Design a protein around this ligand. Structure first.
Ligand code: DUP
Ligand code: DUP
Ligand code: DUP
Ligand code: CL
Ligand code: MG
Lengths: 123, 123, 123
């Protein structure tokens, strides 16, 4: 079970489209306007305690990606307890409108290793 | 064992370079012209049933990345049964030519979690 | 335990901040000047033997992401025994400077699969 908190009543619970979907839909908590060739940190008003040995990759919705919208950053650490921001980059030709409640990205919980690092002289 | 279909004869089986290569090579099944500052959906004519508790990341080739070619979207869900498409972004200064058979990207089967979500008030 | 090798005394050992961090900080080994709209390969002068059944992802730092600095390529294969290079993309407005010892990205050891493929008729 992954515990999550809405910071304000503008936050929508992250949802999964289907039982075989890779990620959990993230929603914009506020209204944003993104000019062509600009980028914008979008607040979700969702904070969460991630599961152990993984991280949340904020990944792009495919439809938005064909409109020219990409993702910046997107690394949500296992110990990040703050507001989750989606960095949207408008690489399209037109101003991109974000309304409160718009599906803006997907959060994928990606399993990872935390290995020890040891310096040697030859591999 | 991942099962895949060649939708048309122009589809080419994804292959790994080496036993230590992260990704399977995706090939273009058609011929494309992509001008500077534009993107294009490339059809592979491949569809596949992904391994359970995982997804397919369409990741960039290092070669094309240095020439300013990037990858959009890239999330290939576990329950996806359609044609796998690749979003090539041309951020370089010259028209990038896509020939039938050209390696364009690499599918990576990334291990993930599907946790249940529960709403709480404090973390 | 993942072994690594410094190619020069200009390379800096990758670092961990906290138990819940995603990955390991990668540092520049040389001085670079990246003009707006350009990408530049950044040598870390670090070679390592990646652990089995995974790959290192050169992942963006959010601080830079917001300034307009994006990652290109970024797939470090299991059997890569060469110099790890970070492709930094200046999609910002000003020129981006990189001094030796600058925190440029993070490395994430993402768990992956190597399934055998099998062509079929139906799915
Ligand atoms: O680059 C891509 C991205 C997605 N796809 C396919 C695979 C994926 O399973 C499917 C996703 O379609 P949807 O747009 O219905 N879902 P998405 O996750 O993109 O966002 P949302 O569900 O919010 O629309 O499209 C590609 O072929 N290439
Ligand atoms: O798209 C993002 C990216 C990061 N974040 C969060 C997670 C991360 O823990 C935090 C960034 O904290 P830092 O002060 O460590 N930023 P820095 O640039 O130093 O490194 P990094 O961004 O890699 O943690 O912002 C988001 O909410 N959305
Ligand atoms: O950003 C990167 C990406 C890859 N690399 C390394 C790791 C990887 O093993 C290798 C990329 O493979 P190639 O140099 O053989 N290029 P090619 O296009 O042939 O294969 P790939 O699809 O892996 O790039 O370079 C970097 O140093 N920086
Ligand atoms: Cl990833
Ligand atoms: Mg979906």
């Amino acid at each position: 079970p992954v515990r999550f908190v809405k910071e304000t009543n503008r936050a929508k619970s992250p949802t999964r489209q289907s039982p075989g979907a890779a990620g959990y839909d993230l929603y914009s908590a506020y209204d944003y306007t993104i000019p062509p060739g600009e980028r914008q940190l979008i607040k979700t008003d969702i904070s969460m305690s991630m599961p152990k040995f993984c991280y949340g990759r904020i990944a792009p919705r495919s439809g938005l990606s064909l409109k020219g919208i990409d993702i910046g950053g997107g690394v949500i650490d296992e110990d990040y307890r703050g507001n989750i921001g989606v960095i949207l980059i408008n690489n399209g030709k037109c101003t991109f409108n974000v309304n409160t409640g718009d599906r803006i990205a997907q959060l994928i919980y990606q399993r990872i290793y935390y290995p020890e690092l040891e310096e040697v002289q030859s591999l």
